[PDB]
Design an enzyme around this catalytic site. Structure first.
Site, PDB file in Angstrom:
ATOM      1  N   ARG G   9      82.481 -12.363  52.282  1.00  0.00           N
ATOM      2  CA  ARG G   9      81.923 -11.168  52.668  1.00  0.00           C
ATOM      3  C   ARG G   9      80.946 -10.594  51.532  1.00  0.00           C
ATOM      4  O   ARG G   9      80.402  -9.470  51.650  1.00  0.00           O
ATOM      5  CB  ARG G   9      83.026 -10.141  52.904  1.00  0.00           C
ATOM      6  N   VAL G  10      80.840 -11.461  50.552  1.00  0.00           N
ATOM      7  CA  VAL G  10      79.896 -11.022  49.183  1.00  0.00           C
ATOM      8  C   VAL G  10      78.773 -12.127  49.550  1.00  0.00           C
ATOM      9  O   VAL G  10      77.600 -11.498  49.078  1.00  0.00           O
ATOM     10  CB  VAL G  10      80.719 -11.113  47.777  1.00  0.00           C
TER      11      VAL G  10
END
Ligand SMILES: Nc1ncnc2c1ncn2[C@@H]1O[C@H](COP(=O)(O)OP(=O)(O)OP(=O)(O)O)[C@@H](O)[C@H]1O
Ligand SMILES: [Mg+2]
Lengths: 231, 365, 52, 269, 52, 115, 73
Positions: G9-10
């Site tokens: 999710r980065v």
């Protein structure tokens, strides 16, 4: 039970045995008892046994029972079907397909079964006659898929002769009932076990191969097929 | 009459019957029941709609649709929305039933829709577990079957002697009734769940709606292969009872020979004839929302397909053919449609009259 | 037969123009029916709406 | 893992079963089409045998090489009930007898599976054709046949045989091998010469027996496919039946677990 | 000429049928306008009565 | 999603896309067992459009540039309707399947096919 | 590592400039290659685009393989 004590043979009809099991599940939950497998009452086998063990042939009379059976989620291993089948002596299956053919009794001769269909109980003669009819009816169901996929000419002479006896057998399984005169437009008939065995034994042996199959439809005993034929 | 060709021809509903509408979420359950209410505005049947656990803006869109179609003046709307007490949601079906029983006990006919019996069961479960009553399967109380059975056995047809006894002689010669259309939602087609199993066993028949059919453009989504009415032909007028018999055979044949559609050339001619008939009757069942059809208008479509008048119509033009045929008869045969709509009667003059009109339609329109 | 066929064809040719034009005549009656019933429908929606 | 996955697998197997059911009936229809195309070539073969017979007898001075001392047919589609294997198992058996006797062997491949069997084992070939329609025409076989007839004339081949399945019946496809090369009162008028005509008739007769063989093998392909699609439909049902038992076990097990959790929490609260 | 005698009937029938369809679509277009124009007129008076 | 709320052109395009994807959900297993060859031509032709429509539904978003690596795109409903209608008509049946993946408007898809 | 089910999710913000540019859409490309392989298992000869994608996919799959205790700079 009262009529049996009188010296009679009695019929007990139960509209649905699954609803008897469910009513026991509902009462068991209301009384707060801990539920068993698949959520049924812990007393499932005992509640079925208390009802079913009174239905028997005594030394005075005999209560015979016809019970309609429902199968949850079409699963025959579910606790209710499983427990009920343990107390059944015969299974009568009514078929929607057979009804379309025009046989109103509509009992499926291949799916329906009885524990009394044993030569050590009904004698060799009744057993061989019944198994002969089932053998012929099985072969005809296989041959019908052949006739449909490949055609009627692909069959042997023995197979086409069998198909002719199977069709005659299939129609001779029909019968006019006294309560169905309003639908059939013909009088009712009560065939004896003796007349039943004798009629099917002859058709399997080929004693009636010259008669048209229709002559074997809605007639009762085998002599009535012979007379419906002369006309 | 519900106004749907698939329901009124194959799954007929009679006065005093209980027919379940069963299926997954978002597939037309509410639309089928609301259209069945809209079709009663001229029939003589008073209607009741009970909303249990719905949001207030959804109930208002149904009332706005009952008002736009002229059906609101013939309907009682009972509401117990999602923010209201579980006791009110549990009692609403019984309150609506009591309002429907007025007309039945006095010699008249009524229709009641319970929009979610599954939400009434959920509200009764909440009250029971909070009173600490012993739980059963899916945590429901031991009397959840009795909850729905006590409600649904009130929907009935009563004899003339009951109506003369209740009215104390005032109403005579008339039999009253209350017809019910309960609705239930299934999770991923699982009809074996506890509440659905109970209600399927209590009702006189079931109309099953399917997600696969609804996504394949079959808008009414009625699976006619498993849906059944135990009352059957006794709940049909003479004309629809005569033209529904072949429709049943053609759809049954289509369910059996539908994989051969991609190998239809290699099919045998007899079978290829049956296959296209099955595909044309299947396309005839498709209908639009808020468009109920009358006994005469349904009869034209069923007659045209059952007597072979679609064999030269491309399966893709069957609908415009139906819509144009009805519009033609509404203008040049208004007297014959009015005659059929009296009782749904059938005879050699009506049969010849419809035939002459369809032959003339093909010759000019 | 060439002149007789030209006459037979001349009659069938023109009769089809008159018969085809009658389809347009049914269409004009249908167009009038659509518009007249639309006026009655619009009147019906007008009296139904103002009552609220 | 659970009841969710088994429903998808039972639906997956049920969809495939319905199409394999139709393919058995499609195959039966195509089998009947290939059986009439078999019968529309017998007259040209039985009459030319009589002419080639009598014409040699009345002209003993000429003894064509074909009258004194492998073409393999395979399918273009799958689904056959080991029809290609059973013939390829008779091709290998006969080839062995000749390798033991010491002779070399040149081969003609008709169809896709024949080529596959030779590319998979590095086998030799002198002629090859595939993609022939379910309705073949004799003109396509002319090229492949010519590469083989000239051999026998040039001595490049001592004997020629056709390897194809034979349509014994709707249930039987006999793999067989037969020799293509080597093979009343009154007499005929010959135009232009008898020798000129015998040379022409013998090529028409060999190209005819080869076409008879291809067409019959196509009828065998359709029948074999019918039985294979029947087997596949039956096997699918057995898998559906077994999975349904596992689904019922998963269904019953899920219910008992939930009840235990409900009862367990209620016995604490 | 017997071909032309049915081709100029068939062609003119397709043209007349297209004209009949155009006449019907023009009437359908005219119909929705007649209904929604009456709705706006009725709504305007309803809102006027409410405001007053 | 109702012709009386939006319009018949939008509704027909939406139901058209759904019809094509619903039919392909059943042919997927048919293609796994057996093969593609055994299908009828209409099924072979439908399978191609379904796989393309599935890909044409993909749109690169500005908030996802950190993950996608590509620039974000914004498609107006007009372009959304136009593109899907064309694919359903079969106008872009001349484009490879890989050209509709993350291509915003149909126009871009025509350009991606050239790379 | 199942590239279709696994996700960060980065994303690209957790990578150095060189690896960020060179590894562009490789996971979503591997996720699509795993799907293309199953579909084309029993099909007839497909277009150059399909054959090229199927060949390129089998190479990144073999490259992602590494031995235990053997890290890379
Ligand atoms: N002919 C039709 N019959 C039924 N529904 C249709 C039809 N044509 C279109 N639809 C649409 O299908 C959807 C059905 O919604 P509806 O509320 O009736 O479904 P539902 O199953 O009752 O949903 P829910 O479970 O949430 O209450 C609506 O958008 C409706 O407009
Ligand atoms: Mg609803």
């Amino acid at each position: 039970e009262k009529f049996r004590d009188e010296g009679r043979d009695v019929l007990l009809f139960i509209d649905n045995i699954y609803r008897y099991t469910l009513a026991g599940t509902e009462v068991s939950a209301l009384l707060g008892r801990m539920p068993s497998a698949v959520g049924y009452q812990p007393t499932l086998a005992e509640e079925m046994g208390v009802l079913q063990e009174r239905i028997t042939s005594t030394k005075k009379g005999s209560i015979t029972s016809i019970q309609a059976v429902y199968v949850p989620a079409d699963d025959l291993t579910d606790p209710s079907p499983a427990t009920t089948f343990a107390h059944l002596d015969a299974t009568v299956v009514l078929s929607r397909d057979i009804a379309s053919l025009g046989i109103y009794p509509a009992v499926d001769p291949l799916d329906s079964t009885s524990r009394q269909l044993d030569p050590l109980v009904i004698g060799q003669d009744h057993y061989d006659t019944a198994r002969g009819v089932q053998y012929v009816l099985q072969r005809y169901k296989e041959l019908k898929d052949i006739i449909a996929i490949l055609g009627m000419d692909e069959l042997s002479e023995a197979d086409k002769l069998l198909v002719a006896r199977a069709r005659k057998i299939q129609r001779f399984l029909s019968q006019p009932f006294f309560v169905a005169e309003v639908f059939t437009g013909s009088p009712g008939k009560y065939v004896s076990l003796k007349d039943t065995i004798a009629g099917f034994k002859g058709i399997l042996n080929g004693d009636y191969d010259h008669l048209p199959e229709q002559a074997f439809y809605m007639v009762g005993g085998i002599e009535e097929a012979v007379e419906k034929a002369k006309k | 009459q519900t106004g749907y060709k698939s329901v009124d021809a194959m799954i007929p509903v009679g006065r005093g019957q209980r027919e379940l509408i069963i299926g997954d979420r978002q597939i037309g359950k509410t639309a089928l029941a609301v259209d069945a209410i809209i079709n009663q505005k001229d029939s003589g049947i008073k209607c009741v709609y009970v909303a249990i656990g719905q949001k207030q803006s959804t109930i208002a869109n149904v009332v706005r649709k009952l008002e736009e179609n002229g059906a609101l003046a013939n309907t009682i709307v009972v509401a117990a929305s999602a923010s209201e007490s579980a006791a009110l949601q549990y009692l609403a079906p019984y309150s609506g039933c009591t309002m429907g029983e007025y007309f039945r006990d006095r010699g008249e006919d009524a229709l009641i829709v319970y929009d979610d019996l599954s939400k009434q069961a959920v509200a009764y479960r909440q009250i029971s577990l909070l009173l600490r009553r012993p739980p059963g399967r899916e945590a429901y109380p031991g009397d959840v079957f009795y909850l729905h059975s006590r409600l649904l056995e009130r929907a009935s047809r009563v004899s003339e002697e009951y109506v003369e006894k209740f009215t104390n002689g005032a109403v005579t010669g008339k039999t009253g009734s209350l017809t019910a259309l309960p609705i239930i939602e299934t999770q991923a087609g699982d009809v074996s769940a506890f509440v659905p199993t109970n209600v399927i066993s209590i009702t006189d028949g079931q109309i099953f709606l399917e997600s696969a059919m609804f996504n394949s453009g079959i808008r009414p989504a009625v699976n006619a292969g498993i849906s059944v009415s135990r009352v059957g032909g006794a709940a049909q007028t003479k004309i629809i009872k005569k033209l529904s018999g072949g429709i049943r055979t053609a759809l049954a044949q289509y369910r059996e020979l539908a994989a051969f559609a991609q190998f239809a050339s290699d099919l045998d001619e007899a079978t290829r004839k049956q296959l296209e008939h099955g595909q044309r009757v299947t396309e005839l069942m498709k209908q639009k929302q808020y468009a109920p059809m009358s006994i005469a208008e349904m009869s034209l479509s069923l007659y045209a397909a059952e007597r072979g008048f679609l064999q030269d119509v491309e399966i893709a033009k069957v609908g415009s053919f139906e819509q144009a045929l009805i519009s033609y008869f509404q203008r040049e045969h208004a007297a014959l449609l009015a005659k059929i709509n009296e009782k749904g009667d059938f005879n050699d003059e009506i049969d010849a009259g419809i035939k002459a009109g369809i032959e003339k339609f093909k010759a000019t329109q | 037969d060439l002149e007789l066929a030209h006459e037979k064809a001349g009659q069938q040719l023109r009769e089809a123009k008159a018969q085809a034009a009658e389809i347009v005549e049914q269409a004009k009656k249908r167009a009038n029916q659509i518009v007249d019933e639309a006026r009655d429908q619009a009147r019906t929606e007008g009296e139904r709406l103002k009552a609220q | 893992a659970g009841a969710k996955e088994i429903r998808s697998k039972i639906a997956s197997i049920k969809s495939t079963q319905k199409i394999t059911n139709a393919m058995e009936k499609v195959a039966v229809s195509k089998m009947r089409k290939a059986q009439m195309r078999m019968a529309a070539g017998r007259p040209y073969a039985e009459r030319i045998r009589q002419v080639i017979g009598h014409l040699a007898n009345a002209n003993p001075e000429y003894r064509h090489p074909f009258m004194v001392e492998y073409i393999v047919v395979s399918s273009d589609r799958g689904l056959c009930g080991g029809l290609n294997i059973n013939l390829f198992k008779s091709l290998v058996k006969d080839m062995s007898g000749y390798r033991e006797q010491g002779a070399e062997i040149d081969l003609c491949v008709i169809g896709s599976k024949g080529a596959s069997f030779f590319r998979s084992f590095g086998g030799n070939v002198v002629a090859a054709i595939s993609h022939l329609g379910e309705e073949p025409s004799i003109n396509d076989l002319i090229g492949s046949v010519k590469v083989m007839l000239d051999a026998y004339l040039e001595g490049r081949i001592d004997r020629l045989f056709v390897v194809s399945n034979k349509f014994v019946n709707t249930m039987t496809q006999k793999p067989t091998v037969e020799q293509l090369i080597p093979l009343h009162h009154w007499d005929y008028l010959y135009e232009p010469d008898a020798k000129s005509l015998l040379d022409g008739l013998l090529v028409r007769y060999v190209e005819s027996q080869v076409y008879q063989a291809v067409v019959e093998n196509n009828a065998c392909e359709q029948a074999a496919r019918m039985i294979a699609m029947k087997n596949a439909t039956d096997n699918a049902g057995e898998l559906i039946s077994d999975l349904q038992l596992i689904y019922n076990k998963a269904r019953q097990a899920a219910i008992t677990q939930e009840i235990s959790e409900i009862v367990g929490g209620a016995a604490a609260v």
